């Protein structure tokens, strides 16, 4: 009902040094993995690339990914980081 986890990575573009992670939310569900695992993954991606010290710099973005009539079965939430 109000339990979700497992926020993973979805994009790592060296051009502009942008890392994007995504996580899922069911219809009547919430999601906040740990507020720190996303930072760790972003830092790992930046280190893998030529940058480092990822910064959140933004706010979560939620766009529906599954449509069932006038509803939203699943919602995708994105976290952006700017490697520096």
């Amino acid at each position: 009902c109000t339990i979700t986890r497992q926020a993973q990575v979805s994009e790592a573009s060296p051009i502009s040094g942008i890392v994007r992670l995504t996580y899922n939310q069911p219809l009547f569900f919430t999601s906040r993995t740990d507020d720190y695992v996303s930072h760790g993954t972003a830092t790992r991606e930046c280190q893998q690339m030529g940058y480092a010290d990822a910064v959140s710099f933004g706010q979560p973005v939620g766009t529906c990914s599954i449509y069932a009539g006038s509803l939203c079965l699943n919602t995708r939430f994105t976290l952006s980081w700017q490697c520096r």
Binding site: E11, S13, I15, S16, I18, T63, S70
Partner: protein, 58 residues
């Protein structure tokens, strides 16, 4: 040819007509403001945008 031994009469016909066609048209006359998603290596911009309108009942 004393009888109708040589009397002859014959007719034959063969008519064929085939046709085919297909059409496909589409038009779009809107204006939408989009946001850049990422900057490519050559400088091209990946743009994504969305607009939701609820006039009434939908």
């Amino acid at each position: 040819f004393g009888n109708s031994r040589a009397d002859m009469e014959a007719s034959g016909g063969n008519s064929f007509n085939g046709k085919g066609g297909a059409n496909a048209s589409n038009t779009f006359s809107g204006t939408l403001t989009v946001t850049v998603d990422q900057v490519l290596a050559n400088g091209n911009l990946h743009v994504v945008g969305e607009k939701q309108i609820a006039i009434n009942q939908g």
